[PDB]
Design a protein around this ligand. Structure first.
Ligand SMILES: [Pb+2]
Ligand SMILES: [Pb+2]
Lengths: 497, 497
């Protein structure tokens, strides 16, 4: 049926091994964050490394590569079998772009740069990370040359994190935002409409109270606990796919500002539902699973912002908040709504509201493009970051930790990564209007906890496709168009004005 | 220092990969029992299988095998480097003894036999497992021929589960038992000394009560929770070693008969301490970790029976039982002692007291030797089992589930396995007297929760050695003698008379 071709089948058979190591890498990663006794890190780390080299070795074995090439030279194949080849070709390609010596240099520099960044952020000192940032800039440019690119070198890094993404693509969405979203922010901020803060931010809670609420919400979403999924706690919330029938998410309980743990769980649910609603005929193959960071964040932001911060979701969860939270006997459902939608330009990207969030990514996009294109100097980055933070949000970091040092990404060498976050927020708005068309009683269904039709919509339009088509081709096919920042602007306009 | 030789080092480097897959297999196995959502079994199972073949493939790679052979031809090497070779030679040897076609036949037959046994036990029908038992008997004999053996074919299976174990060895310990332990049992059973049952067996408890007690006991043992170890719940208690700095044990809360969860946790602690107190200079090498099932059960039975069922341990935990168990306000510490040491011949091996336990293994030993030696018939096994149960314990199974069908072992094909359980019980007694010599205030230290000297004793005598020496050579070196069933008899005599 789905996989008929003989060459395709020999590929998939070998792929199972590669798939198996990945299954193990997932469990290892998850357990490291969730259960592993502190001192087990050294042995966990070596195990993780030996497998990564093994995995890489298997993917590039002459036999495997020969089969892929061969199959790529076949015209008989259906879309599914073709997907296998597109996906695996991109993998083999990216994998052999880096000379083993370079992969080594990066691992080394990265490891040491993260450690140097980690203390530099805590002690507010950019000098302890500066040199490392210059080394990371050089590697990025080299990487761009190893990968190859048509227009700009930055296209190569961007394409690394989002298949088919180009600098011109990123350049465009941010233009639409700077001219149409920026003013909307100013207007919102000056009318005193929504508040910049809320007293519920200070309300303290005991872990068990909120885990009762989160649990309740996940059950309302139909999250298959104990059967195909799990919810646990970790330093930072994340989602993992051990398989189509085993997807797990985590969250954290800060102990205060309950909005955090709630929306964070919903955000991850969004990533999980996607993996959960994959097509089981693709099990053990490279076509199963989300196609990219961008499409993936479209799913997490859909559930978090489109639904989680909507008034209906607030009414739905309101009674549950009252039952488990004592301090809730002093607030009304509107109080919770205003709380869930506060808008306030601030220093930290991870804390930014939905309106100010994308500007944090835009500035990171500008510094990144310059870093890899012109001859930028690390020692000069802090000021460019600060001037940008000031030009977009009116505020200026007073210490490195509130500015250029807040995120780990650059120290890990993740250059060209940041823009996929904006893509998700944008796509989450676009998707909303398209579903708002086939399900006009969207809001009513949310208020009543009838999410099956919405889950089913997402499945048919995005999820079931897995990695069959590249990100862009996937959108056209399912939404009849490409990404368009415009929707995000309307969504915001229609929500705050 | 420890690993100097160049050939040894190239071996250890390649071994890391093999070691890494094993690290992953452990995590996979553990998570399957402890966290995995029910439906994730298919994908977990395939992952587990692909790795086992990979592992096997790596162990037998010409490069690896050539290095081992080469090193085996070196006379310069220290005991440690030598240990590496002994261990790896035995592994490569055992691994290539079975033709790939045979490994396949067994996997197939085993899988289907376990399923057929699983229903056969539930529906009390031996016919649904009988044919499968005949197939398993044939494989066992073939296996013995593939492995090779000097005296009996059964030596080959025995050696498979306990390096260096011979049928003559097993034959001996059971002789000493049948003539010296058997009467002791009769005497004990006829004087009304210890009871055959206790009312505390019926006392019900809520999970949280007992997990407070278990937790307390593990902390009294110095079990490094959150740092190098964990305690969780699973269908059946077991211990796993993800690493020297990551060892985990589980237990279960039946909900009644609290002795079970307590001693079971202590039993597993025994296995864990062993892995925990390994020598870190052997990390990532084949010499780190327990040498065999036998030595391992010596450690679990040491802590479970030598200490866990001793009067001092009962006094130590007594106050804690009172605090968390309401129904305990009706019993005294002697009541708990009698309860912990009841003696009663019964049908189920896993439930047998320490005095009647070894007879369950002796009968399994007799049927196993005949099955692989003479031309035994599956259809005739039930009656031989029943006559043996009657000849040793006076009772006769009335249904297959109480007899020949109670254990999974044969259906898994684990023939020649059972005797390692007796070895552990025996060795746990021998060890007691040897430690009773260097630490005559043994009992006093237990009553006061001063276990460090006892842990240290075990480390120096057994644990630190890892897999450097074969089981037998290990005993001689550390205890100045070989296993001798006699000690177990005295221990029992000195405890019940
Ligand atoms: Pb996310
Ligand atoms: Pb055990």
């Amino acid at each position: 049926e789905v996989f008929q071709n003989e060459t395709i089948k020999q590929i998939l058979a070998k792929y199972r091994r590669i798939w198996a190591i990945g299954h193990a890498q997932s469990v290892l990663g998850w357990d490291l964050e969730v259960n592993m006794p502190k001192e087990g890190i050294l042995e966990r780390s070596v195990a993780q490394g030996e497998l990564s080299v093994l995995s890489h070795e298997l993917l590039l074995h002459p036999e495997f590569v020969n089969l892929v090439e061969k199959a790529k030279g076949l015209e008989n194949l259906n879309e599914y079998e073709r997907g296998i080849v597109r996906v695996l070709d991109r993998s083999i390609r990216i994998a052999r772009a880096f000379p083993p010596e370079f992969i080594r240099e990066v691992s080394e520099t990265t490891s040491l740069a993260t450690k140097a960044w980690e203390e530099a952020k805590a002690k507010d000192d950019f000098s302890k990370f500066e040199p490392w940032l210059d080394k990371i800039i050089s590697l990025a440019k080299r990487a761009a040359e190893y990968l190859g690119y048509e227009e700009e070198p930055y296209d190569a890094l961007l394409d690394l994190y989002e298949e088919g993404l180009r600098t011109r693509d990123v350049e465009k969405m941010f233009e639409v935002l700077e001219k149409k979203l920026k003013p909307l922010l100013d207007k919102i901020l000056e009318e005193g409409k929504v508040p910049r803060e809320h007293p519920l931010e200070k309300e303290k809670y005991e872990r068990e109270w909120m885990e009762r609420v989160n649990l309740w919400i996940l059950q309302k979403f139909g999250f298959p606990l104990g059967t195909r999924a799990r919810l646990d706690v970790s330093a930072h919330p994340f989602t993992t796919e051990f398989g189509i029938r085993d997807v797990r998410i985590t969250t954290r309980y800060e102990g205060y500002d309950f909005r955090r743990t709630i929306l964070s769980t919903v955000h991850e649910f969004g990533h999980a539902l996607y993996e959960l609603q994959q097509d089981e005929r693709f099990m053990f193959t490279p076509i199963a699973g989300g196609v990219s960071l961008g499409i993936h964040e479209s799913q997490s932001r859909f559930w978090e912002n489109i639904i989680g911060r909507s008034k209906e979701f607030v009414e739905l969860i309101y009674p549950v908040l009252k039952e488990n939270l004592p301090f809730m006997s002093n607030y009304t459902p509107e109080d919770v709504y205003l709380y869930f939608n506060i808008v306030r330009p601030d220093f930290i990207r991870t804390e930014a509201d939905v309106v100010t969030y994308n500007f944090h990514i835009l500035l990171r996009f500008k510094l990144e493009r310059l870093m890899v294109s012109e001859e930028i100097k690390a020692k000069d980055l802090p000021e460019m970051w600060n001037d940008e933070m000031e030009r977009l949000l009116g505020i200026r970091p007073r210490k490195y930790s509130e500015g250029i040092l807040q995120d780990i990404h650059w120290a890990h060498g993740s250059i060209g990564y940041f823009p996929t976050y904006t893509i998700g927020t944008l796509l989450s708005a676009q998707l909303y209007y398209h579903i708002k068309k086939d399900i006009p009683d969207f809001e009513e269904k949310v208020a009543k906890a009838e999410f099956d039709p919405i889950k089913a919509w997402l499945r048919e339009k995005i999820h079931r496709w897995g990695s069959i088509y590249p990100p862009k081709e996937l959108l056209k096919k399912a939404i009849g168009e490409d990404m368009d920042a415009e929707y995000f602007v309307r969504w915001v306009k229609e929500k705050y004005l």
